């Protein structure tokens, strides 16, 4: 199938309560593989997947060097952003960053990303052409001009098309037994009597990887788009995911309802009835 690699990082100022915290995380698809926490004692990029552990001490040294320098850069970036906005130093602020690449099943480059958010809102983003920036406001427009004058886009193009796809490919091969798997959902319905004239039907999906899935309710062939409670896809903690969709049902009307389930691990969509 097609795959992705992402790195996410968050710097948060902790005014009066210490120096900014930096946390970076690396994913291949819905699987985490590395982490760096500035607060941790280790002060190193650390393994988070069995298949990354095989990388020699050189990898861990370089990765540590790159993430530490990024940590310190983002600490100055918070100070720059405070200045751009004339914000009080009493306030706590967050810079988030995401970068990485998509590849196809044959391993070819499909898409590159390199984008920032300041205080949970878009700041600057590399456009799909990997040649220009989308700046969200006047402060980001200032950053954008500095980045145009410095040819930063060209550095990111070269990383996203180069090191990023090479790394993703190596990880996908080394972690083939895990990454290349697609665990279809174990599905079931439950019934919970509420009152006299009502009960909840709940449709479960358990133990699926990857996280993408669709769950849908119908009352005899017709969709039930607005009476369905649908929770967020949540991690089971073991590599897999869970989700449920529920509808409230008039007593004696359970037979009218069907649950519908779509996942890439499923040759054909499941239908469930009580």
């Amino acid at each position: 199938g097609s795959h992705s690699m992402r790195y996410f990082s968050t710097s948060v100022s902790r005014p009066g309560r210490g120096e900014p915290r930096f946390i970076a995380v690396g994913y291949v698809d819905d699987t985490q593989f590395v982490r760096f926490d500035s607060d941790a004692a280790s002060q190193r990029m650390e393994p988070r997947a069995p298949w990354i552990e095989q990388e020699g001490p050189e990898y861990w040294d370089e990765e540590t060097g790159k993430v530490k320098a990024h940590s310190q850069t983002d600490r100055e970036n918070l100070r720059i952003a405070l200045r751009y906005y004339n914000q009080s130093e009493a306030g706590s602020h967050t810079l988030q960053m995401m970068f990485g690449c998509d590849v196809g099943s044959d391993g070819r480059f499909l898409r590159g990303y390199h984008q920032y958010a300041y205080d949970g809102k878009d700041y600057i983003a590399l456009k799909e052409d990997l040649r220009s920036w989308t700046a969200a406001d006047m402060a980001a427009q200032i950053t954008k001009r500095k980045w145009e004058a410095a040819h930063v886009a060209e550095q990111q193009r070269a990383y996203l098309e180069g090191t990023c796809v090479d790394g993703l490919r190596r990880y996908l091969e080394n972690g083939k037994e895990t990454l290349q798997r697609t665990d279809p959902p174990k599905t079931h319905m439950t019934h919970h009597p509420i009152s006299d004239h009502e009960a909840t039907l709940r449709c479960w999906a358990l133990g699926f990887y990857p996280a993408e899935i669709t769950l849908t309710w119908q009352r005899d062939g017709e969709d039930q788009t607005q009476d369905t409670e649908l929770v967020e896809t949540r991690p089971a903690g073991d590599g897999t995911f869970q989700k449920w969709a529920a509808v409230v049902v008039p007593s004696g009307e359970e037979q009218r309802y069907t649950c519908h389930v779509q996942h890439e691990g499923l040759p054909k969509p499941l239908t469930l009835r009580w």
Partner: peptide
């Protein structure tokens, strides 16, 4: 593999 990039805002 993390990017090799010091970039300031």
């Amino acid at each position: 593999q993390f990017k090799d990039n010091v970039i300031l805002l």
